[PDB]
Design a protein around this ligand. Structure first.
Ligand code: HPA
Ligand code: HPA
Lengths: 340, 340
DNA sequence: TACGCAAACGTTTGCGT
DNA sequence: TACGCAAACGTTTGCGT
């Protein structure tokens, strides 16, 4: 049915129907009842399409993600969605896989559907990507995963990935290790280069040099972890500890080690990053830096609703903070006792 | 801008603008150009909201999931979304967590947003849930995870979870085991009771009795797996092999074993179910039954588009098929050599 | 005091000529 | 031959009385 149908069945104006449906003005009880009565028999469902046409807002948010399968991403997504729901919003999920065109498409479809705001999680931000985004400065949006603020027309949440890298390297140091290797994620990403550099700073501070044979690039996918660990323990001289850029990648590293008969951490200590929900059940239970995923979603959604409801103009940035989680994959290194 | 704005800037009727924008009728080149010209300066973005008002379709599909974090679910979701995209559709993701009210809410918001169709993945289907769903028989929909066809007004894709349980138990049998334990998922779910029963049939066939001290209920969450494995290997008499209802749960089982110093599979063979993307990197690499996740999404989306575009009336059902993946978590059991 | 009329949001399309 | 007019989709709201 349409509002007209209900109005006729209730013997009232459509204006009236709309008023009871939205509590936008006082309506006599008996009137209000009859309308409800009508609303029910006809089995009426107001049309958000029509409403949005008038009121100029869809109560829809669009997430332009990289992928949603990856544990990391998946945890954030579910976080963002929880908040949309409690605040009445509907989520439009779009994965662009780091593909420009795909991005151009989703962006477009999004604007056409008139999303009240946009949450961007694209991992890498090449100029061209930045370009398109700007062409959409009119839609309120927050990038949730870049280093600093890439754009000047968007809100940003900073993860402090660097102080996260440092924390990791420090722990290793403080545990007795000085022969460390690293499997960073894509250098083109914040959680990639960011973590790595935080980590290398700690190293330079300790005068630890990390030989390039010990730095093998990952892609956040287990296979890459698996493969890198292999290249690392396949060398004559091999590290006593390893900083792995992402948990899922580390899970790959564990496997390879186990397959070459190495023991974690008795033979090689491994420390990861993300603290994904299952990291604790890795074998052995993984020690890693925790990315505050939930608050990362809630924070982003909140900066968005702000710009939305309170029509904020100026771009804001909110920092979030990673913290070390000790588990059972790191063991004392050769220099523990000799440490001042 | 609005179409009116572009029309004026192009010195043409809005009808004309709409025709070039939609290639719905021949328009002179020079005309077509000018319109585009206009379309670009004003930076115009057609309004899907307005369009849908007229044409009566939103080109939106709504996924009413249980949760989207869980590896299993997450893999399916990303599958469904890939298909929506290539076919032009937009995805509205809604997690209801098995909460009736939450379900009632999302359903409602969905109908209001006038989704062209609904994809339901609610895990458990209590009567009340069934009730609400029926009240929405008008929206085309397919349940992707039930046993048989729960409703007569919806399409269904059947996973054959039972022949999956059987396959698992058979393998165990054929490997030499006769002392098997099981950690099924929620009995209230298809992938729960279904898998279990497929499995028990195989057992009855071999005259293997599974003592209740050896059946510990899981919930598809690693912790539950962890806890159950513990209760299983904490008994005086303990099984030589274990069928674990879901991979993620099994990952928990592996951990516990490892923690009690047991060896997999030298001490206990473990077989899982789902074949989630990282199962191969479990330690040791997990042997399990593969749920065809991708085709499960694509199949569902396709039955949906059917009812949609081809206005199909009668409810269809398409079966999909699980298949055993051998890895390194199962070892020959005491009766291999004695097997006829 | 409680309610209704008519315009309006941005499009598509019928039926012109 | 190529194009325009006006109605219409389902609502909200201003300004009545
Ligand atoms: O880009 C990423 N992908 C997957 N997991 C991650 N964790 C941090 N960054 C990433
Ligand atoms: O309900 C479920 N939850 C998580 N993983 C699963 N794999 C099969 N069924 C399920």
């Amino acid at each position: 049915a349409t509002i007209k149908d209900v109005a006729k069945r209730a013997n009232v104006s459509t204006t009236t129907v709309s008023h009871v449906i939205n509590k936008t003005r006082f309506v006599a009880e008996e009137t209000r009842n009859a309308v409800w009565a009508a609303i029910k028999e006809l089995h009426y469902s107001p049309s958000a399409v029509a409403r949005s046409l008038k009121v100029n807002h869809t109560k829809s948010i669009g997430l332009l993600a990289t992928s949603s399968e990856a544990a990391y991403f998946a945890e954030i997504i579910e976080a963002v969605e929880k908040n949309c729901f409690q605040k009445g919003y509907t989520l439009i999920l779009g994965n662009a896989w780091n593909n420009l065109e795909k991005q151009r498409a989703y962006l477009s479809m999004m604007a056409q559907k008139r999303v009240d705001g946009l949450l961007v999680m694209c991992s890498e931000y090449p100029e061209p990507l930045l370009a398109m985004l700007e062409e959409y400065r009119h839609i309120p949006m927050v990038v949730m995963d870049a280093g600093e603020a890439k754009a000047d027309f968007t809100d940003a949440v900073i993860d402090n990935a660097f102080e996260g890298g440092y924390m990791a390297g420090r722990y290793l140091i403080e545990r007795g290790h000085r022969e460390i290797g690293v499997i960073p994620g894509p250098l083109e990403r914040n959680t990639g280069a960011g973590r790595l550099a935080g980590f290398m700073k700690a190293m330079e501070e300790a005068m630890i040099k990390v030989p390039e044979s010990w730095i093998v690039q990952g892609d956040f996918e287990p296979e890459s972890g698996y493969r890198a660990m292999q290249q690392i323990l396949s060398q004559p001289h091999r590290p006593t500890a390893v900083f792995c850029g992402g948990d899922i990648m580390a899970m790959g590293a564990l496997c390879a080690a186990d397959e070459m008969g190495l023991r974690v951490p008795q033979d090689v200590s491994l420390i990861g990053y993300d603290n994904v929900r299952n990291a604790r059940y890795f074998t052995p239970a993984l020690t890693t830096i925790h990315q505050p995923k939930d608050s990362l979603g809630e924070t982003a959604f909140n900066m968005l609703l702000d710009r939305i409801v309170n029509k904020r103009e100026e771009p804001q940035s909110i920092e979030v903070h990673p913290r070390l989680i000790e588990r059972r994959s790191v063991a004392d290194g050769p220099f523990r006792d000799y440490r001042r």
